[model samples]
Target: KIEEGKLVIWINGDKGYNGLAEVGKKFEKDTGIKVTVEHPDKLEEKFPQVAATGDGPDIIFWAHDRFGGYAQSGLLAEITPAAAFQDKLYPFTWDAVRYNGKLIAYPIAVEALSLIYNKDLLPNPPKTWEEIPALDKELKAKGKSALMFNLQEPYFTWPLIAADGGYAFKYAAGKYDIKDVGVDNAGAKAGLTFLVDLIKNKHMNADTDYSIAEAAFNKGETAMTINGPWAWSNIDTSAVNYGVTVLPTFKGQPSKPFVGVLSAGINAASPNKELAKEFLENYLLTDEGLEAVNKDKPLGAVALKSYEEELAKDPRIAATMENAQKGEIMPNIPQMSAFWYAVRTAVINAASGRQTVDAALAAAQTNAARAFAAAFIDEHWKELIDRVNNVDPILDILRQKKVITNEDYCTIRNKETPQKKMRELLTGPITCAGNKGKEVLYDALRESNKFLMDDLEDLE
Candidate 1:
């Protein structure tokens, strides 16, 4: 049921829509289909609601992170891009747009944290964290700080925390094991200790936030800071002679920041899905389309390899792409919410001296484990209910462990179907039994349905 004569798209801002507006005209001229680009507000909240009813835009543009949730909800159509187009884009760009081994969006541009330094203050950027102390001493003599950034932000500090191999979750074989939180590992502790030392030595301010750090960098009060391409507009207005480069090494390992991708995807419910895909494949991903959008506001480090030579003309884009190549794609799993909350708490606690780095990270690990477990169950409830074939064994264990009464167990055991029995167990006893009962059920699931427990095995 293709909608004839019209295609509508929803992008977040004027710059994105304006770029698409040019491509829309070309598309209209070729296909006799009018194209309308919109700058919609509150897309995250509004999109799901309207998309569910089959009334949202045919195309939607947003960060890749949100696509995971959209894909899980069956809101996005699986994109089958043209083979040539796929081959022309950077391979890393696909990471953020992939969910459950399926490509969900067309990646447009990439962003990652990198060292942005005032070239006049530090004739050369430090190659490693070890050199920062000497640089700090030199800068102190000139009444300037060596570095500053959003000290308590996990996104800004993740490269240092993960330099020695710390991670929120274990990603392998194209999936994340949400239960295997590594935030409190020795590598993470070492990273946090280094950050705490920077504060104790007065090399940087513990209170520095994004605004303060950006302001200081603009004023040339700091020699360097970790930032991304998005801040260039703000930095360009200042007189400071700034340069962007990959983050310094930490503990002999390359600093790996989280990479984010901006992408365009099709709505599952769009009446004109084929037309939308054609528009994307034939027009939106072409050189002219990308160049038109970038004209309004430069899209830093576009994912297309053909754009590389042009991107290199700007040192900032080139450096950002280099750093992005060395970075990890930001984890798109639902459990990442827990990671952010737990890590933020740990960073604030350790940086503010309210707790030791070890204590803070340990608490973070515990909190993250609990939070991830709950989120996992919620996210995969229907799958768990359908897939656990040995529901009887799990019920027996629950009854033996006193998580459920003998009578409640018998009632569930007698349900009409295996799924019904599992549903009753989850919705009734597990719901009322609280965290302790959930733990008991989690243990039972581990033994009877090990596959489902893969994401929760590391839970304490």
Candidate 2:
């Protein structure tokens, strides 16, 4: 039936998503709004692209990290809930949605990894990272392992790195200061050394993917596993009774997990902005709606205080809340995209027996520094590349030094969109920056830095 108040919402259609469809049906019956829910493929990466074209759903369910790029690019509408509306939600949920001080999304679920253990395998859970290693001796007789996680993946490995003193970016002046990257600092070296020891001792393998790790824990081959609440539905409790708790301390410091929020945001270019807001603020954010969402997703906490209290009654969600409260929120800034690949590459090479701890850290340091240079370029490429194309003064002097060739200079200037062209340059070959191939990128990055930071903006 055609209607004046109809809308479409794109949400993650993984297991237990039927509850969301039910909510849409109820919204239609009560408000005559005829809400439709679609579970599109590759929703996370596809969202920003579709929204930019002004043809995406009115409301979208996605993680908060991607919001930084979307909001910065003007693809997301600023969310302005009614007065005191924020009071009903956790203070941190509001923090997750704020971009340049404007709230840009509605928080749906808060997620973080906890130490999930099989009840029958252990009487007491570990209180520190060292304690986890000691459990291997006790479990070896049963042919079971003490612990398992996606060790090669940065998401699970980051807390360990942070505990040993590595940080992606330092927080300062109410924002992340990218200049303070500590990826290869002394503390980071100690953490990577510890990981190297784990690989050498056969405590765990470098090849443990998500499925293999999760399957091992569920089958009782591992006593404990580090994972988030999203694994609750997939765990076969009939086979192994499991419980969740906060991650153990590392090197006398508490492991700081990265908290991620699954949220709802409106497309900036949507014609039905008011209708979208009304549906979100009035219906979806209500207690009933929150319950239905939880029935399907079992989030650690809902944004609303009343719903949070109700959801906390479930032990799984309660333990997850404890972990998230102790963890640091994953920084939702565009520059963070640079942090992931650099760190992951370092982890992979080091864990796979390809590089020693010191060598791996050195490579990570260089790669990360190069990424920061590229990030700055990507952020201001339109202006910087335009000047390069027009043969601006300081950039022209570089050719005189024989640093850039006639072909190299012509290649950069010829692109229809310099932003995409520069991104292409930063990808592929520049990822590892192995051997002399890196000098070319490093050289251009150096020149771009001089032109932008020295010629234009103050480095301060």
Candidate 3:
């Protein structure tokens, strides 16, 4: 059933497509197989649906973050690289593309957040967070702030929280334990307290977003901001003299941002998977091919160690790569979607003084755990429906939580059999209740069916 004569790749933006197009032409010319590079809108949303039908493109180019969900859902083909090819890549590059110890994609480039400072305003960047206040006092006279960034963004703020030992998930033995969320840990509280203090003391703006911070930095209205290498394109166009450096220490602890890898993965269901693999290994991954891509647009920090000399030539890339070495690879797990939403809300609430740091993080932890449980149930809906022998206890809990009305509960209980009753509850009441219903059902299951909950934990 293998398709012949052509290969298709779906990439995110025009710049990425343009770069790949150059390499695709060479691949087609060398192999007698046509190669098409496409820039598709809403790729993140469309890819999973199309890929589910086995009608998606042969290759997908995206950040390593989404590969975990794709790999779990059987949407991505496992990638096996020769030892020589593996040795050529930076060691950390593997962290982002590996799921359950299996390589699922080819990492092309890596990036992480760093402190980008305005050199003309501050001759030297602060070495620690404690030093920011003095700089803020100096800058305040000129109507500027010492530091600013996307205040509510978890990606940018994670480094600060992590400097004090906070983490989104417990990573051990080369796997992320999604069930063990740590966003509300003691270290997280300390990190968030520092952020809140800065905002309260007027050293940093709680109202700032990525655009506002970038504009302020470009206008030389801020001494420093947290950003990644991708911001260079816009920053370079401004008159501000800027320099990139690793983030300052928080109470002497080194800040560790999340390292994000941009990777290319083959679709598991692609009819031309062999051809796609051949092109990826022989053409797209070559030094010359990467060079062409970089020429189209700077790739920031390439994952290939062989390209280090070229990357080092750019100071910004060098600084970014250095910071990346100290960073934790952004956890590529389906649970991270929940983690992002929970932590972003916590950071914003705490920073804006809408809630105490402890209260915000506590709420975030509960919310995240509930979200994880809800997602787990959805993903294993059929299995749960088959195995859940007892429905009375779960229904009662749902009633107590007010997720189901008295009349609705009575109707479900009146069903002819337990299986029929469970089906009605899951499809009717729970479906209508949305996330809140799912969360309540998860709690009820934990109390009523420990055995089933344990099995689900094992599956996760």
- Report the number of the highest-lDDT candidate: 3
Off by more than 4 A, model 2: 1-6, 12-16, 32-42, 363-460
**Clash pairs (backbone) in predicted model 2:** none
TM-score attained by model 1: 0.70
Score every model by TM-score: 0.70, 0.77, 0.75
Model 3 residue 441 lDDT? 87
Output the lDDT of residue 63, model 3. 79
Q: Residue 446 of candidate 2: its Cα lDDT?
A: 47
Worst 10 residues of 1 by lDDT: 451-460
Each model's C-alpha lDDT? Answer: 0.81, 0.73, 0.82
* Residue 104 shift from truth in candidate 2, angstroms: 0.7
Q: Can you write out model 3's per-residue Cα lDDT over 1-460, one digit (the tens) per residue?
A: 2255688888876244677888999988888889988877657546775788787788898778888878888999988888988888887788779899899999888877889999988888999988888889989999888998998578888898888878888878966776677888888889989889999987877888978988889988888988876677667789988899988998798898988888999989887777887888778777888888777656778888777667778888878878887778787887666777678778888988899999999877866665655766665678777888888988888998999999988999888777788788878888888787887888788788768876665521
What ranges in model 1 sit over 4 Å off?
A: 1-60, 172-175, 200-202, 271-275, 295-297, 312-314, 367-460
Model 1, CA-based lDDT: 0.81
- The number of residue pairs in model 1 that clash at the backbone is 0
**RMSD over all Cα atoms, model 1:** 9.5
Flag the better candidate by lDDT, 2 or 3: 3
Which residue ranges in model 3 land beyond 4 Å of their true spot? 1-17, 28-46, 55-57, 172-175, 201-203, 370-460
Question: For residues 284-367, could you state the per-residue lDDT of candidate 2 as single tens digits?
Answer: 788998777667756666778888777778887777778777667888887665576578777888888888877877766655
